[PDB]
């Protein structure tokens, strides 16, 4: 029975590592849209000018 502890442990441990890389990943949307919005705001220059 002593191995069952390790077995149950490792799936949770690896899923936590999964969450780590997932949160690393999602930053892409933050910077992508920051750029998007600032550029689109500037694009009004062409219209108003």
């Amino acid at each position: 029975v002593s191995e069952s502890y390790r077995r149950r442990r490792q799936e949770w441990e690896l899923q936590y590592k999964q969450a780590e890389w997932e949160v690393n990943s999602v930053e892409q949307q933050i910077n992508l849209q920051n750029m998007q919005i600032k550029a689109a705001n500037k694009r009004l220059e062409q219209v108003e000018a």
Binding site: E3, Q18, W21, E22, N24, S25, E27, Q28
Partner: protein, 32 residues
């Protein structure tokens, strides 16, 4: 940002290779 995709997939490759492959010893075999 997508360098995180290689981070995740590389870690998965590593994890599962180390997990399944060449498993050995009394650390498991002790009871037999």
């Amino acid at each position: 940002a997508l360098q995180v995709s290689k981070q995740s997939a590389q870690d998965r490759y590593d994890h599962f290779k180390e997990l399944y492959d060449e498993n050995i010893s009394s650390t498991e075999q002790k009871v037999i």
